[PDB]
């Protein structure tokens, strides 16, 4: 695309500058350019890709929720015309476009080249996340298939992570956290969400003794998110 003429290393360097400048749309465009060079991503590069798109889609999701709430209030009320629905639809279409972009990068060809557990689980978790973001706005005949696509990606990531990673590994923990959110918020399965969060927390607790001080801090930060959700849910 528009980044085709820029060196891979320059795209990565500029993605890091864009992060420091809080220019997340630029960061995402730079990281998409880097992915499209066709080489596998290092751990740091995968995390830059994730940070960029998480911030872009996060702003869209927050906006969509504001607009959807106004739209639902409008239907409880004075008729204000088509504008709320139109603008919610525009934000929704842009959100779906970003999710499709991320899913396209994963399918062409990040996942198929990812052989190590750390990279494969990272990408499958991302696939689950972006289908989950599509599911948050889905209302039509494909909602069930979108939900199943998220579930399937998360499940494959879970299966690999349980075989290949220790229970404190931050990728494994973040995957379990997000899959538990999927169960609670998308799949109407709060008991599954609670069970997954509890088991994940307890198995990580039992493995903390193996960790360095720095790894301990990384793992316990995510465990606290699991605990925070459990406190909300129970």
């Amino acid at each position: 695309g528009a980044m085709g003429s820029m060196e891979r290393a320059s795209l990565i360097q500029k993605a890091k500058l864009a992060e420091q400048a809080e220019r997340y749309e630029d960061m995402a465009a730079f990281m998409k350019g880097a992915v499209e060079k066709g080489e596998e991503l290092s751990c740091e590069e995968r995390n830059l890709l994730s940070v960029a798109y998480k911030n872009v889609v996060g702003g869209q999701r927050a906006a969509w929720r504001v607009l959807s709430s106004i739209e639902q209030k409008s239907n409880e009320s004075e008729e204000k015309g088509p504008e709320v629905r139109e603008y919610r639809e525009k934000v929704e279409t842009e959100l779906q476009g970003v999710c499709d972009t991320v899913l396209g990068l994963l399918d062409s060809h990040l996942i198929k080249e990812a052989g190590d557990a750390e990279s494969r689980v990272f990408y499958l978790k991302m696939k689950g996340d972006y289908y989950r973001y599509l599911a948050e706005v889905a209302t039509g005949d494909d909602k069930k298939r979108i939900i199943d696509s998220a579930r399937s990606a998360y499940q494959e990531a879970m299966d690999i992570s349980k075989k290949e990673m220790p229970p404190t590994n931050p990728i494994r923990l973040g995957l379990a956290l997000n899959f538990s959110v999927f169960h609670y918020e998308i799949a109407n399965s709060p008991e599954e969400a609670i069970s997954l969060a509890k088991t994940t927390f307890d198995e990580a607790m039992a493995d903390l003794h193996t960790l360095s001080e720095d790894s301990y801090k990384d793992s316990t930060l995510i465990m606290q998110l699991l605990r925070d959700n459990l406190t909300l849910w129970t």
């Binding site: 956290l177 959110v181 918020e185 995510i222 998110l225 925070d228 959700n229 909300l232």
Partner: peptide, 7 residues
């Protein structure tokens, strides 16, 4: 409030 996914 609302539950949180990975930061």
């Amino acid at each position: 409030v609302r539950c949180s996914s990975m930061s």
